């Protein structure tokens, strides 16, 4: 008789989620060229934007669509006394919309977008114009339900910057 | 490889709105 | 020698809902097997949710991901004296989150999700549990910038019916 | 070819306690008002409801949750010139919702529910009220992926009837 | 050949006027 | 004919509490990190405890989880005029609970536990505190239905002692 394989399970008392100790199963794998751009556009809108009420999803989504280097740059925006969480907090919010995106090469695209600040006193600040440069790739499908239902394509930002647009019109 | 992973932001833990 | 164990069943003590805890299984069956769950999630969340401040995008997105028959059913929810726009308006809001989606056939899937109402007085209503049945297809890439940047895949709901639990649920 | 019978490690949502396979296979495997009312609801809704677009899943699910005697009674509703498939076909649809379920004994419960007919001309028939009496047991976990992902508990109807409710109010 | 296109319906966002 | 594997072991993520299903959690024929904890607990509790009504299972289980040397030491506790079967018999009972187990090496662990005596007159003796030292190994899965449904992991005590705690 081979020794009964060790059997162990963990039960989350808060979510009632039951998970086997043994390593999980691998998934499907195919390469799609037009997957990085869609993930990058969704990540950019969640990243620059802010709302106390929805930010946890935008925050995790941005990280899900970011290389660890990029994730850290992003996480840091919520740190210290000047943290978005303290500056905007639940007193002010940021609305972001993308006007146009045009790929320019081998894992690189230009995103033209706007942003504006709204607040608890019912006022709105003048909108600003910004342009992001995104370096990106795809890492294929993720192997967790919490990731595949947000970024199935594997979009990942490897480099990111966004500068003010100067409206020399 | 793909190495999907994160140590993401506390989403649920919002602070005391003053 | 290889032997297979069983996914344990998790019974929610509050809802009596039985969830299958997968045994070392994270397998994805095919292109759109998990991609479909993304679209089904985003569809239900945006369709069922409401916030005066973001609804224009969720509204247009829902229509973008709906067959004309479905679009009309949806549009009608914002009509008349009992319109979501008048009932919730800017006094109350709906938060929606999907727990699990499992495809079951040829253009059909089951979406298990929850919903709750928040309001201007800072109160929150008890959360409800609901299950949506979605009939769907894909119509391929759209040919407008305002559509491709929201639904590039062409996801389209052809039939939709979400039923809440009876009494408590 | 027959393998270890599927074992449900029932997890308590309040305490996180883990149960094991039991003699419930040779008894009523479904246990707890909360759990039984769920199965009774899903059974009635799927059995009584109809939509050309989703019925294949509701049809197979109903059979999956029915004793062969019951399955045959159900299958027959789709037979002959008066078949639901010909009467409703893709011209009319049935919407079903359960209001309340209360167990009353040893494999028996009462389901109070409503039903209404919608159609292709955009009209809706007046809703009707009905009450189902369900005799039931549980046969334990099934041993096919196509069954366990729909009825892991083994719910099975052994007797079924539903009569019009007379609203003597 | 597809005819695969989205529906047409009243606007998704409408004014949230106060009262 | 087919043979059976282990079923499941409960490990509450919030409380760290360990619950054993009828199929005993396997120790993988090794002392383990939690394998020693659950088996060491069940061994001490069943070995030290006594109830006329359930002892046949605890007795056989203890033997199932014991090396022949250990089994004999245990069997002897039920022999002679001072036998547990005559002293406690169906007049008094022993309740045992383990407070904490900490492995300390290569087939060895320390078990901190308590014990108390209850009886037919409805009285209870003051609880005592004891510490067991257990030497152990695993012999792999057993090949009898009556053994695999009790000790699938093959837990086996090779040395045992328990002294009063001061």
- Are F5 and D7 inside 8 Å of each other by CB? no
Write out the E strands in C7-103: 8-11, 18-21, 92-103
The SS3 assignment for B5 reads: coil
Beta strands A108-119 and A92-103, pairing class: antiparallel
Q: From the CA of F4, how many Å to the nearest CA of chain C?
A: 9
Tokens 């976990």 -> residue: D141
- Name every chain D residue with its beta carbon within 8 A of the beta carbon of C166: 37, 41, 97-101, 112-113
Phi, psi of D14 (to 5 degrees): -100, -35
Question: Which chain B residues are Cβ-neighbours of A15 within 8 angstroms?
Answer: none
C88 touches chain E (CB under 8 A): no
Angstroms from F89 CA to nearest CA on chain C: 42
Interface touch F5/D4, C-beta < 8 Å = yes
Closest CA to A16 of F17, C9, C37, C7: C9
Phi, psi of F154 (to 5 degrees): 85, 25
Task: Give the H or E element holding residue A35.
Answer: none
Question: Any idea which residue has 């990540």 for tokens?
Answer: A43
* Contact list, F20 vs chain A (CB under 8 Å): none
- DSSP track, A102-129: EE-SSSEEEEEEEEEEEETTS-BPPPEE
Q: At how many degrees (to 10) do helices C35-48 and C55-64 cross?
A: 130
- Enumerate neighbours of A (3 or more CB pairs within 8 A): B, C, D, F
Answer yes or no: are the C-beta atoms of F37 and F134 closer than 8 Å: no
State the best of A10, A14, A18 to mutate against chain D, taking most chain D CBs within 10 Å: A18
Give the span between the Cα atoms of C68 and E5, in whole angstroms. 9
As a whole number of angstroms, the distance between CA F158 and CA F135 comes to 5
Determine contact, residues D116/D94, Cβ cutoff 8 Å. Answer: yes
Whole-angstrom distance, CA of residue C65 vs CA of residue C39: 8
Count the residues in chain C: 169
Q: What is the rounded CA–CA span in Å between residue D159 and residue D139?
A: 15
What are the structure tokens assigned to F35, written together?
A: 């394998």
Nearest to C150 by CA among C141, C137, C163: C141
Question: F9-12 and A9-11: which strand pairing?
Answer: parallel
Distance of CA F79 to the CA centre of its chain: 20
| Residues F130, F111 contacting (CB under 8 angstroms) | no
Concatenated DSSP letters of chain D: ---SPP----EETTT--B----GGGGS--S-SHHHHHHHHHHHHHHHH-B-TTTHHHHHHHHHHTB-HHHHHHHHGGG-STT-HHHHTTTTEEEEEEEEEEEE-SSSEEEEEEEEEEEETTS-BPPPEEEEEEEEEEE----SSHHHHTT-TT-EEEEEEEEEE-----
Tokens of C141: 């890439």
**Is D16 close to F21, i.e. CB distance below 8 A?**
no
Q: Please indicate whether chains A and E are in contact, defined as at least 3 beta carbon pairs under 8 Å.
A: no
C98 touches chain A (CB under 8 A): yes
**Domain D34-135+159-164, CATH class in plain words:** alpha beta
Instruction: Looking at the complex, report in whole angstroms how far the Cα of residue F8 sits from the nearest Cα belonging to chain D.
Output: 8
CATH of F25-164, one of 3.40.50.150, 3.40.50.2300, 3.20.20.70, 3.10.450.230: 3.10.450.230
How far apart CA D66 and CA E5 sit, in angstroms, is 41
Give the residue carrying structure tokens 């919309």.
A97
Best probe of the A interface among B1, B3, B7, B8, by most A CBs < 10 A, is B8
| Cα gap A44→A160, rounded to integer Å | 10
Query: What resolution in Å is listed for this PDB structure?
Result: 6.2
Residue of F nearest to D12 (CA): F12
- Inter-chain residue contact D54 with C11, CB threshold 8 Å: no
Q: How many CA atoms lie within 13 A of C101 on its CB side?
A: 30
Exp. method:
cryo-EM
Q: Where do the domains of chain C lie? A: 30-164
CA distances from A69 to A28, A65, A152, B1, F153 (A): 27, 12, 21, 16, 45
* Sequence-ordered list of residues with C-beta below 8 angstroms from that of D167, at least 6 positions apart, any chain: D129
Spell out the alpha helix ranges (H) of A52-99.
Answer: 55-64, 68-75, 84-87
Give the fold, CATH level 3, of A32-163.
Nuclear Transport Factor 2; Chain: A, (3.10.450)
Rounded to whole angstroms, how far apart are CA atoms D40 and A153? 39
Round to whole Å and give the CA distance between B8 and A57.
10
Cα dihedral A146, A150, A154, A155 sign: negative
* Residue A128 tokens, joined: 């600003």
Which chain C residues are Cβ-neighbours of A38 within 8 angstroms?
Answer: 152
φ/ψ of residue F29, rounded to 5: 50, 30
Contacts of residue A12 in chain D, CB cutoff 8 Å?
Answer: 16
Determine contact, residues E14/C85, Cβ cutoff 8 Å. yes
Which secondary structure element, helix H or strand E, spans residue C163, and what is its range?
strand C155-164
Q: Quick one: which of C21, C26, C1 has its CA closest to C11?
A: C21
Find where tokens 């679009």 sit. C71
Report DSSP state, residue C72: H
Name the phi and psi angles at A54, rounded to 5.
Answer: -125, -10
Do residues D17 and D11 make contact, with C-beta atoms less than 8 angstroms apart? yes
Task: Pick the closest to residue C100 from C128, C70, C126, C132 (CA basis).
Answer: C132
Question: Is residue A4 within 8 angstroms of chain C, CB to CB?
Answer: no
Closest alpha carbon within chain E to C138: E4
- CA C123, CA C92: separation in Å to the nearest integer? 10
Other CB atoms within a 10 A radius of the CB of residue F41 amount to 20
Q: How far apart are CA C91 and CA E19, in angstroms?
A: 11
Nearest chain D Cα distance for residue C3, angstroms:
8
**A15 has a chain D CB within 8 A of its CB:** no
Residues of chain E with C-beta less than 8 angstroms from the C-beta of C142: 5-6
Rounded distance between C-alpha atoms, residue C103 and residue C107, angstroms: 8
A-chain residues within 8 Å CB-CB of B8? 59-60, 63-64, 71, 75
Under a CB-based contact definition with an 8 Å cutoff, are residues A97 and A113 in contact? yes
Helix (H, G, I), strand (E, B) or coil at F72: helix
Q: Whole-angstrom Cα distance, residue F82 to residue F74?
A: 14
Spatial CB neighbours of A136, under 8 Å, sequence gap ≥ 6: A36, A39, A40, A107, A108, A109, A155, A156, A157, A158, A159
CA distance A114 to C56: 17
* Helices and strands (DSSP H and E) totals, chain F: 5, 6
3-class state of residue C11 by DSSP = strand
A2 by Cβ neighbours in 10 Å (0-12 / 13-18 / 19+) ranks as exposed
Contact A84, A92 (CB under 8 A): no
What's domain C30-164's architecture? Roll (3.10)
């Amino acid at each position: 008789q081979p020794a009964p394989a060790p059997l162990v399970l963990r039960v989350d008392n808060a979510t009632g989620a039951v998970d086997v100790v043994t390593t999980l199963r691998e998934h499907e794998s195919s390469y799609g060229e037009v997957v990085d751009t869609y993930w990058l556009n969704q990540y950019v809108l969640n990243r620059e934007a802010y709302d106390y009420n929805t930010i946890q999803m935008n925050y995790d989504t941005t990280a899900l669509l970011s290389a660890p280097a990029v994730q850290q740059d992003y996480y840091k925006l919520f740190d210290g006394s000047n943290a978005r969480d303290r500056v905007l907090g639940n007193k002010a919010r940021i609305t972001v919309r993308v006007r146009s995106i045009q790929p320019n090469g081998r894992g690189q695209a230009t995103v033209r977008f706007t942003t504006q600040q709204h607040n608890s006193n019912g006022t709105v600040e003048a909108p600003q114009h910004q342009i992001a440069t995104i370096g990106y790739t795809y890492i294929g499908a993720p192997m967790r339900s919490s990731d595949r239902l947000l970024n199935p394509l594997g979009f990942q930002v490897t480099s990111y910057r966004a500068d003010p647009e100067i409206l020399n019109n | 490889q793909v190495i999907p992973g994160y140590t993401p932001r506390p989403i649920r833990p919002e602070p005391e709105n003053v």
